[PDB]
Design an enzyme around this catalytic site. Structure first.
Site, short mmCIF file in Angstrom:
data_model
loop_
_atom_site.label_atom_id
_atom_site.label_comp_id
_atom_site.label_asym_id
_atom_site.label_seq_id
_atom_site.Cartn_x
_atom_site.Cartn_y
_atom_site.Cartn_z
N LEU A 22 0.78 -1.27 -0.04
CA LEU A 22 0.08 -0.05 0.03
C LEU A 22 0.85 1.36 -0.07
O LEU A 22 1.85 1.26 0.54
CB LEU A 22 -1.02 -0.13 1.12
CG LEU A 22 -2.26 -1.13 0.87
CD1 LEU A 22 -3.32 -0.74 2.02
CD2 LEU A 22 -2.60 -1.12 -0.49
N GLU A 30 -9.00 0.60 8.89
CA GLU A 30 -9.32 0.56 7.39
C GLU A 30 -9.37 -1.03 6.81
O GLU A 30 -10.21 -1.44 6.10
CB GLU A 30 -8.50 1.37 6.36
CG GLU A 30 -9.31 2.01 5.35
CD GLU A 30 -9.38 0.80 4.16
OE1 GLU A 30 -10.59 0.84 3.39
OE2 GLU A 30 -8.47 0.16 3.70
N1 LIG Z 1 -7.24 -1.07 -2.72
C1 LIG Z 1 -6.18 -0.99 -2.49
O1 LIG Z 1 -5.47 0.04 -2.05
C2 LIG Z 1 -5.51 -2.15 -3.44
C3 LIG Z 1 -4.17 -1.99 -3.48
N2 LIG Z 1 -3.62 -3.25 -4.03
C4 LIG Z 1 -2.27 -3.10 -4.61
O2 LIG Z 1 -2.35 -2.74 -5.87
C5 LIG Z 1 -1.12 -3.52 -6.50
C6 LIG Z 1 -1.24 -4.95 -7.37
O3 LIG Z 1 -2.09 -4.87 -8.40
P1 LIG Z 1 -1.87 -4.72 -9.92
O4 LIG Z 1 -0.36 -4.21 -10.41
O5 LIG Z 1 -3.09 -3.74 -10.46
O6 LIG Z 1 -2.16 -6.08 -10.65
P2 LIG Z 1 -3.67 -7.10 -10.37
O7 LIG Z 1 -3.72 -7.91 -9.05
O8 LIG Z 1 -4.63 -7.41 -11.47
O9 LIG Z 1 -2.54 -8.28 -10.92
C7 LIG Z 1 -2.29 -8.59 -12.18
C8 LIG Z 1 -1.91 -9.91 -12.77
O10 LIG Z 1 -3.27 -10.94 -12.47
C9 LIG Z 1 -3.45 -11.16 -13.86
N3 LIG Z 1 -4.61 -10.60 -14.28
C10 LIG Z 1 -5.29 -9.52 -14.01
N4 LIG Z 1 -6.38 -9.29 -14.51
C11 LIG Z 1 -6.92 -10.28 -15.12
C12 LIG Z 1 -7.98 -10.94 -15.70
N5 LIG Z 1 -9.03 -10.21 -16.07
N6 LIG Z 1 -7.84 -12.19 -16.24
C13 LIG Z 1 -6.44 -12.89 -16.15
N7 LIG Z 1 -5.78 -12.37 -15.61
C14 LIG Z 1 -5.87 -11.14 -14.96
C15 LIG Z 1 -2.15 -11.11 -14.67
O11 LIG Z 1 -1.55 -12.27 -14.36
P3 LIG Z 1 -1.13 -12.89 -15.85
O12 LIG Z 1 0.19 -12.07 -16.03
O13 LIG Z 1 -0.55 -14.30 -14.91
O14 LIG Z 1 -2.07 -13.11 -16.69
C16 LIG Z 1 -1.47 -9.78 -14.06
O15 LIG Z 1 0.05 -10.07 -14.03
C17 LIG Z 1 -0.31 -3.67 -5.55
O16 LIG Z 1 0.39 -2.56 -5.29
C18 LIG Z 1 -1.16 -4.00 -4.30
O17 LIG Z 1 -0.53 -3.50 -3.02
C19 LIG Z 1 -4.50 -4.12 -4.78
C20 LIG Z 1 -5.75 -4.23 -4.62
C21 LIG Z 1 -6.34 -3.19 -3.87
C1 LIG Z 2 -4.05 -9.21 5.38
C2 LIG Z 2 -5.37 -8.93 4.60
C3 LIG Z 2 -6.59 -8.58 5.50
C4 LIG Z 2 -4.90 -8.01 3.49
C5 LIG Z 2 -3.59 -7.43 3.18
C6 LIG Z 2 -3.38 -6.67 1.94
C7 LIG Z 2 -4.75 -5.98 1.03
N1 LIG Z 2 -4.80 -5.19 0.02
C8 LIG Z 2 -4.07 -5.39 -1.20
C9 LIG Z 2 -5.81 -4.31 0.32
C10 LIG Z 2 -5.84 -3.68 1.80
N2 LIG Z 2 -6.80 -2.60 1.78
C11 LIG Z 2 -7.61 -2.63 1.32
N3 LIG Z 2 -8.96 -1.52 1.70
C12 LIG Z 2 -9.89 -1.69 0.95
N4 LIG Z 2 -10.81 -0.48 1.15
N5 LIG Z 2 -10.01 -1.99 -0.61
C13 LIG Z 2 -9.23 -3.25 -0.58
N6 LIG Z 2 -9.28 -3.90 -1.73
C14 LIG Z 2 -7.99 -3.37 -0.04
C15 LIG Z 2 -7.09 -4.30 -0.43
C16 LIG Z 2 -5.85 -6.83 1.59
C17 LIG Z 2 -5.87 -7.42 2.52
#
Ligand SMILES: NC(=O)C1=CN([C@@H]2O[C@H](COP(=O)(O)OP(=O)(O)OC[C@H]3O[C@@H](n4cnc5c(N)ncnc54)[C@H](OP(=O)(O)O)[C@@H]3O)[C@@H](O)[C@H]2O)C=CC1
Ligand SMILES: CC(C)c1ccc(N(C)c2cnc3nc(N)nc(N)c3c2)cc1
Length: 186
Positions: A22, A30
């Protein structure tokens, strides 16, 4: 099978991640909100399904995967089986949602929660149908290398409040944030 939802926390400059972590320091309450929203099932006898890309899976500490009390589905075209700890693997979002109406999952799953990352959000957000976004606005700019897609407010209506979601400003570690719920139906 119940509603389709995306959940995300986002900084002011739209960031959601930096090097698979993050952008901001850990906000304990959160994370509790994320756990509570994705785990709580409106229907007994069922669990909610969380769908995530490969990089988001590997961003969760191993001790915490799979996300407990939820069915965990990973999206990837490279992987040939679910990662250690995961339940299901699909090649694409549309394949995952299709699996959700198959024998196995149709009677087991309540709500579906898309929990990241950027390309999975983008696809869901631009696909016709009824969808909610649960968006935590982290009210500062943080250096990031992955961003949440644009929310088109012509289509997504910010709800004036939602049950179970606090409406007022939150603060942890000196960082103010707030919780929002958006709904589209197209
Ligand atoms: N809410 C928040 O603040 C959130 C933060 N995060 C953070 O965001 C970042 C990680 O995410 P990000 O870089 O966007 O990548 P995502 O997690 O999508 O991961 C991408 C990988 O998943 C596969 N993929 C993604 N979409 C699809 C699809 N429709 N079908 C098949 N495969 C798919 C691909 O794998 P392949 O190459 O093997 O096809 C790609 O390399 C991190 O920094 C993590 O900390 C993540 C979620 C929430
Ligand atoms: C240990 C678990 C609870 C954990 C660790 C990392 C993360 N990520 C990438 C994350 C962390 N926080 C998040 N908060 C919201 N509101 N939404 C999300 N999708 C979200 C995603 C999520 C859960």
């Amino acid at each position: 099978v119940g509603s389709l939802n995306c959940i995300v926390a986002v900084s002011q400059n739209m960031g959601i991640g930096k090097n698979g972590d993050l952008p901001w320091p850990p906000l304990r309450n959160e994370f509790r909100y994320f756990q509570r929203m994705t785990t709580t099932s409106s229907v007994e006898g069922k669990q909610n399904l969380v769908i995530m890309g490969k990089k988001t899976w590997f961003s969760i500490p191993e001790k915490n995967r799979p996300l407990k009390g939820r069915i965990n589905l990973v999206l990837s075209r490279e992987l040939k089986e679910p990662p250690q700890g995961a339940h299901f693997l699909s090649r694409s979002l549309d394949d995952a949602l299709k699996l959700t109406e198959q024998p196995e999952l149709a009677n087991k799953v309540d709500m579906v929660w898309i929990v990241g990352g950027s390309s999975v959000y983008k696809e869901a957000m631009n696909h016709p149908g009824h969808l909610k976004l649960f968006v935590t606005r982290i009210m500062q700019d943080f250096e990031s290398d992955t961003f949440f897609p644009e929310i088109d407010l012509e289509k997504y209506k910010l709800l004036p409040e939602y049950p179970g979601v606090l409406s007022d400003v939150q603060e942890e570690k000196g960082i103010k944030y707030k919780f929002e719920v958006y709904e589209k139906n197209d």
